[PDB]
Design a protein around this ligand. Structure first.
Ligand code: NAG
Lengths: 38, 49
């Protein structure tokens, strides 16, 4: 990302309303087993 | 770059931790400001010709 390099979450092309503010147009959520998505 | 840092941290880094929490709150707060001023309606209509 423009904010930095993110390790530990699975990137998804689809977009939802986000609750964890990462920055530079990226967000985080815990729903998908179950893993953190960006 | 001091050769002792763990002693310095456990004696005085907690003030910096609280102030870093204040700055993180200010940062997320500014992001929420931008969101509430530009995303009042979350609908995307394409610009017509
Ligand atoms: C997401 O988009 C990239 C763009 O190259 C593509 O390679 C990837 O397969 C896409 N993933 C899904 C799950 O659609």
């Amino acid at each position: 990302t423009r904010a930095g390099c993110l390790i530990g979450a699975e990137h998804v092309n689809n977009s939802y309303e986000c609750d964890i503010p990462i920055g530079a147009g990226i967000c985080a959520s815990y729903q998908t087993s179950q893993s953190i998505i960006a | 770059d001091s050769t002792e840092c763990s002693n310095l941290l456990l004696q005085y880094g907690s003030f910096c931790t609280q102030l870093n929490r204040a700055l993180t709150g200010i940062a997320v707060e500014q992001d929420k400001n931008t969101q509430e001023v530009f995303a009042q309606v979350k609908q995307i209509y394409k610009t017509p010709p």
